[PDB]
Amino acid sequence: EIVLTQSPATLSASPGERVTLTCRASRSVRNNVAWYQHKGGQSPRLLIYDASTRAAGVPARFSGSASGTEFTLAISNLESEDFTVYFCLQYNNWWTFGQGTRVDIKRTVAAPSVFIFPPSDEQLKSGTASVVCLLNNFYPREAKVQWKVDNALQSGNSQESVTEQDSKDSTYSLSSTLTLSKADYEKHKVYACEVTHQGLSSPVTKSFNRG
Amino acid sequence: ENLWVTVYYGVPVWKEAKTTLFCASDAKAYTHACVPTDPNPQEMVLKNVTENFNMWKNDMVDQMHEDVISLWDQSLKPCVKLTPLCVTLNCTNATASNSSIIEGMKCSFNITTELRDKREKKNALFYKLDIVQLDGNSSQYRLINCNTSVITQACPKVSFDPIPIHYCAPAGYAILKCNNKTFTGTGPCNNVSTVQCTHGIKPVVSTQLLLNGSLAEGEIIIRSENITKNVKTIIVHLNESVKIECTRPNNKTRTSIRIGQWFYATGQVIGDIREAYCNINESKWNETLQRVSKKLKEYFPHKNITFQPSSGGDLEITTHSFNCGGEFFYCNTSSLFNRTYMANSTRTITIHCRIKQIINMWQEVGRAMYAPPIAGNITCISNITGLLLTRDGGKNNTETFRPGGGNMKDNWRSELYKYKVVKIEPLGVAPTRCKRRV
Amino acid sequence: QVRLAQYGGGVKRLGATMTLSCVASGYTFNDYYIHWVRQAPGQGFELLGYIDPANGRPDYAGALRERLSFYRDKSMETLYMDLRSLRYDDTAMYYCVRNVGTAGSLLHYDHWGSGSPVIVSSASTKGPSVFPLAPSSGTAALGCLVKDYFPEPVTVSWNSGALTSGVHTFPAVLQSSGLYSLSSVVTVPSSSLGTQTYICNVNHKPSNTKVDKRVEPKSC
Ligand SMILES: *[C@@H]1O[C@H](CO)[C@@H](O[C@@H]2O[C@H](CO)[C@@H](O[C@@H]3O[C@H](CO)[C@@H](O)[C@H](O[C@H]4O[C@H](CO)[C@@H](O)[C@H](O)[C@@H]4O)[C@@H]3O)[C@H](O)[C@H]2NC(C)=O)[C@H](O)[C@H]1NC(C)=O
Ligand SMILES: *[C@@H]1O[C@H](CO)[C@@H](O[C@@H]2O[C@H](CO)[C@@H](O[C@@H]3O[C@H](CO)[C@@H](O)[C@H](O)[C@@H]3O)[C@H](O)[C@H]2NC(C)=O)[C@H](O)[C@H]1NC(C)=O
Ligand SMILES: *[C@@H]1O[C@H](CO)[C@@H](O[C@@H]2O[C@H](CO)[C@@H](O[C@@H]3O[C@H](CO)[C@@H](O)[C@H](O)[C@@H]3O)[C@H](O)[C@H]2NC(C)=O)[C@H](O)[C@H]1NC(C)=O
Ligand SMILES: *[C@@H]1O[C@H](CO)[C@@H](O[C@@H]2O[C@H](CO)[C@@H](O)[C@H](O)[C@H]2NC(C)=O)[C@H](O)[C@H]1NC(C)=O
Ligand SMILES: *[C@@H]1O[C@H](CO)[C@@H](O)[C@H](O)[C@H]1NC(C)=O
């Protein structure tokens, strides 16, 4: 019944900076809030267990405070190790968890190199028509892809995948897939990957037609 | 100016602190039996004294709990240990006509008894809840706790009962007693009173509800912690006491086996067989539940209230548990907690109930007790005073409260809410316009 | 100091019933409530229920009260969880977590368990198919869509592993079919399409199938 909206999705920064994370309560939760660190696929760890009180053994650089119904985690010196995921938590009512927020390396803005791929005709004989986009070496994480085949937007029958920031130049790479049957592939003619990314002014579209 | 320092002794000023409290026993009884002396505690109402109370925070509940454990340990210490009785059981349990209820029946085994070169066959009865099945043939059984703890038979001559206990502070410490009639467990009390000692609190031992305690001054009182709605236990305290009665109508036969410590077992049952059960004033019960629902929806604004029996957990929490003298009960409490709600001795309810001998010690497991059987038929009567409820979270748009309260400390938590203990600070200073003379 | 190990998990077949467990290292078994929380992939955590180790009282989320079950064995300091009739969406990672409880309230989680991944799928062992994501025909991308393999992992490299420039390989997507797939791509100049050799050295250890699938041929 109580939902924690944790914003923003991702925070870019450079080592040593002060960085702030926010957690929004759907309604009042008193001071009954906490914060945790999430490693690269390990046991999460406790950082701040009341609205401001830091947990034992945590470095002093971690901090947070109550803001009425808003709650805020602040790290004074964002170190190299702290570029990871953190999630907030409330316990005024039944337990719930926020979506969590990633902290990642900062760089210059860079748009994706956009490509589109029709199904392999070797694949198409089986009828497992798969159509693929590619959004390679962009920055920041904020991105979206819309599958537009025929003259209509498509949803539900698609899936995406996103890489970690490439260690050398800190740019993400993203790909999207659309799942179609042979009749589904044949019934529609126009096929397009519509790409919207913050480093791009207008939706860049790569498209084709069958054959 | 010219305000010279002056000092005052015997000052009325105090502070909160923990301390070791005296117990106090009755003049007659069965450390505890003869001492400490039975008091005659007095009480004054204090004019303008304003003190805060917190029945969750206060220390003396823990001291009650520790003292109860220590007294039980001391009482149980000289009794016999049932370790040699751990041998394999080869029992088939089909002799008496009403076999299925007990299914431990002359239950055979070997014991060393008089001479240590000898080994002799015996048998006795057991209720199957005190037994576990070994692999292979079902005839192979074992005592339930014997693979995990050592079992002491209760000293029959030292039968212990909920004797009231008065707690007295030592010199320099005073017990503050809130006389407010609608105290919720936290917040200021404007009706402070003080005493030498508390009234006679009994060590009641029960689950899902309590059987012997005091009663509220106002209507039924709700007490719960208020740090978060996600609470562990909610205490509901009755003003209108309601009688409960229970029976064990079958006649038991005591039999003895010597290790020369006299072990006692259950001999052949006499008379036709009934399942032990209880009774409740039917109209009174769910009149009281209606009152409790009306009180409970005060806190929770605009959501339904409903009761269901507890789910999961040991027999100590799935059923109401208590004891008629030297026997223990577990009553299948489905019917009593099945009402639902939305925004005077007729039609008597009866409820089935089971009894078992081998009791894991209430406060904590790892130490086992065995209660010898009580001969003949048994009944005991009590009048309940409150309920121990817990709320199931998660379910949106519908509250749900179910009988819990297996943790033994909560019974005394729900009774020692009256009091607080404060350290006296007799010495103080003040300014005044007079100094010493040379 | 305190540890919460876990066991069980792995693959579980559709509709089956599965059992996890956690072994509580020595802190005190009876003083701390234990909660079972999980995380679907690409989603935030959510709670299933909590079990008091002392008396064994469970309590469940409203959406799974028919399917869940908790219980313990106090002597072994061990806990168990039974979930009945696994559905596809329950593919997720399941955690034990200790709870810091006061005298009358429950507050938060301090120490999490080591984790226990679980995947719901009826698929037998089965090796990938590989197809060329044909280049669009100055710089054009070309890749290999690796389809319908089970179980993880899968191995992919390019040109006997030699071609390392501009190569990316996305993690494994668990389809609705209970079979895994991924895409590996590389960006090269258009001139190289008509001259250079391109391969995806795909190998799948559980099936031991290996394919050096060509990517160049559909440069048209
Ligand atoms: C002293 O004896 C008692 C019994 O007389 C013994 O308690 C028993 O412990 C076992 C495990 O130690 C419990 O077994 C469990 O039973 C439930 C269903 O009742 C199962 O769901 C459990 O399954 C898990 O564990 C299995 C391995 O045992 C796995 O094969 C399985 O896949 C699951 O992971 C488990 O079998 C049994 O319930 C209790 N008995 C009672 C009455 O509680 C106690 O452990 C002994 N003392 C010591 C110190 O061992
Ligand atoms: C509080 O609960 C206890 C029981 O849990 C009640 O005390 C019990 O009351 C019965 C009679 O109502 C007593 O029975 C008699 O005991 C004597 C002594 O052994 C026996 O010789 C008689 O034949 C008869 O059985 C019983 O002893 C007594 N105590 C116990 C431990 O059962 C008590 O009544 C309850 N409080 C109130 C206010 O009723
Ligand atoms: C307290 O008393 C209630 C009775 O009011 C007990 O509830 C009953 O428990 C039995 C357990 O066997 C339930 O039987 C069920 O049968 C179905 C088939 O219909 C089966 O699929 C289940 O696995 C189960 O065996 C019975 O339905 C249930 N009755 C009600 C009205 O809920 C309860 O078990 C008692 N609790 C204790 C701790 O004694
Ligand atoms: C006390 O309990 C009885 C038993 O439930 C109440 O009578 C029944 O209530 C149920 C609903 O709780 C109805 O479905 C039945 O029709 C009622 N009658 C019978 C014969 O079962 C009774 O009303 C309660 N007393 C008070 C004063 O509320
Ligand atoms: C409560 O009453 C309803 C009435 O239909 C019945 O179906 C249900 O089994 C009862 N539950 C218990 C625990 O007695």
TrEMBL record, chain B:
Domain Human immunodeficiency virus 1 envelope glycoprotein Gp120 positions: 4-95, 102-438
Source taxon at top rank: Viruses
Modification after translation, per record: Palmitoylation of the transmembrane protein and of Env polyprotein (prior to its proteolytic cleavage) is essential for their association with host cell membrane lipid rafts. Palmitoylation is therefore required for envelope trafficking to classical lipid rafts, but not for viral replication.
Glycosylation sites: N180, N191, N286, N338
A GO term for molecular function: structural molecule activity
Location of the region described as CD4-binding loop in the Swiss-Prot/TrEMBL record: 310-320
Cellular component GO terms held in the UniProt record: host cell endosome membrane; host cell plasma membrane; membrane; viral envelope; virion membrane
Domain text: The CD4-binding region is targeted by the antibody b12. The membrane proximal external region (MPER) present in gp41 is a tryptophan-rich region recognized by the antibodies 2F5, Z13, and 4E10. MPER seems to play a role in fusion.
Protein name (database record): Envelope glycoprotein gp160
Designated gene of the protein: env
